């Protein structure tokens, strides 16, 4: 508690992401920069926020992946790029 | 780390994992929704990560007296064979009691067979 | 007048009044009139034509099915009809070679008792998609 | 145990939360697709049911099995029910006005038969112990119209040769 | 204690017991999935369960000023014939209502006519 | 509280609280279910609650080099009003936007005279 009340970030890495294949295990949405894209060149900045909000909407997906047979079109995209940024 | 083990044992180490974690996931579900409600991928994964489970089991020599059967002794090739063979489709045919303390996969059929 | 109510397993195909229809039947096409004497028959592949208030036809394929007299409101049963612009006459036409086709590529008699079939699907096509000109 | 456990706990409901919503909004997007076919069929069976309207009264009437009135012996009821669990007190409640009835004909000792649709009519009344003269399941998101047809060509083929006198359709 | 009681106090003792702890462990499917997906053996066992609940309350002539209704004094053996009724099924027509604070299970059945 | 400011403010803020609360409903069902099971009712209510939503937004004088629109400050009076407004039917015909960061409802006007 100390150590997060003073640091300016978080980058927390799960076990269980870990023991599921995800090696760096760096759980997103969590995790946090509060210096953010000021820390950030110019292209990788403008790359970045596509990841942000791709993986954003493949938390939520994510629980209808077991029945995602039957989903909007839209949404079926959405899961799968979640999942190939993933 | 594959540069002792060699990219085949890692590798078949890794997927084990993965596919335990999974079920680990699974079982949750199935515990009040039931079986039923799953994809047929996730039943699938569910009964190879099952049976998984029970072949890491093996009768040990020194427990002969627990278990009143002889215990049983693999090389690592054969492991990784075995494991292999369940990670894949060559055994999704066996129930899981054709595992549970049996020894090397190559008589895992002959439990199955005796069961 | 009177009402007519045209529907398939597969959805309503009309329902209204009307002020005369011509229809397909077993034997022969039959033209039915305001309290015509009531009859029941099955019909063979063609159409019927829905000449509506005004004078307004249009013109419905019947593949298949079963019409209906008894009351003054009559009622008509497909097995299988399309409405008469969702067909066309390319559509008609596949059909015409399908058929010249198949008339061809059948050999026995109960291979041609399916291709005899195949062969009145795509006439009666070949006949709705002209009436459908007027 | 301990609060670690505790922990644990609490992650395992939030998880059946999440699903327990998932399959709600799914199964809402299945209702409104299937309520589509409904309405498509509708107007056919409409139309049927006016159709028997002239068999049930006209001035000429030749005779057919399927219309004669019969003395009642034997009793058939073809009942659909579901492939799923999950759907609450649907189908229970619909399976005791199933009894109920067929209590009422056994009371005067009129025979009864049963012919399903579904895995759970086929067991709750295997469980119950009644007749099944036959049986179609896995009909999942929607059956063809010649796919079901075992229990009414049984059923049909018994009302022709006075196997049953009665013949009932049960669903919600 | 079997030799002290006897046989039939005992037994209805560990009856009562038994379907109680069978309700404790049921609720917890019940407060998630509801009741409809019990199986029809366990919706007996909660409809009785719930009736043995309400059949062990009382009136007390010092809860007489609390409750405003008279006092009951109950013999052991309408005790040991009315739980020994209920688990039998010999009531299981009547509603949970009708054993609520009634002194005998001829009460019950009275209350039972006016609901 | 009434007692403390008013009985307009305090029935305002609780229409406010009120209408944003069944928006919150009725987006459940526009997901679950869709614009067509919504009644004209309950359409009135969400087309209300957009703009009553958007009233609360406020361009600040120090967010100027964000927003490069000058700021704005509102008196509780004109705010009250605004809302009360909004809710009681008249404008209700303006477009949504018209309301978004304009300050108060004499500008929302102007806005929508323009956009």
Known sequence: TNVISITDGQIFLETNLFNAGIRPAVNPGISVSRVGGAAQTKIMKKLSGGIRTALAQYRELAAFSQFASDLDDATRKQLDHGQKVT | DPLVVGQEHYDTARGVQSILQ?????????????????????????????????????????????????????????????????????????????????????????????L | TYH????????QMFSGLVEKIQVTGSEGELGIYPGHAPLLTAIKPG????????????????SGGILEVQPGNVTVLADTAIRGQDLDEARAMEAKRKAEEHISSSHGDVDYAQASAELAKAIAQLRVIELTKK | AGAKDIRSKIASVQNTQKITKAMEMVAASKMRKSQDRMAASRPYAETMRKVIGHLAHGNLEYKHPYLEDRDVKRVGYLVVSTDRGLAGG?????????????????????????????????????SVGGNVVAQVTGMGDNPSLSELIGPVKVMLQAYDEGRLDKLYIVSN
Do not use: C
């Open chain 2, 22 to 114: 999974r079920y680990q996931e699974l079982k949750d579900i199935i515990a009040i929704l039931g079986m039923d409600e799953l994809s047929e991928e996730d039943k699938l994964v569910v009964a190879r990560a099952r049976k998984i489970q029970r072949f890491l089991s093996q009768p040990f020599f020194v427990a002969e007296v627990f278990t009143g059967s002889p215990g049983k002794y693999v090389s690592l090739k054969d492991t990784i064979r075995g494991f292999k063979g369940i990670m894949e489709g060559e055994y999704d045919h066996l129930p899981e009691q054709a595992f549970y303390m049996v020894g090397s996969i190559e008589e895992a059929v002959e439990k199955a067979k005796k």
């Open chain 3, 4 to 11: 007519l109510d045209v529907v398939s397993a597969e959805q």
């Open chain 3, 47 to 62: 159409m019927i034509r829905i000449v509506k208030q005004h004078g307004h036809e249009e013109f419905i394929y019947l």
């Open chain 4, 90 to 126: 649907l189908n229970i409640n619909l399976f005791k006005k199933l009894l109920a009835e067929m209590k009422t004909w056994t009371d005067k000792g009129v025979q009864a038969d049963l012919a399903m649709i579904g895995s759970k009519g086929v067991s709750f009344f295997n």
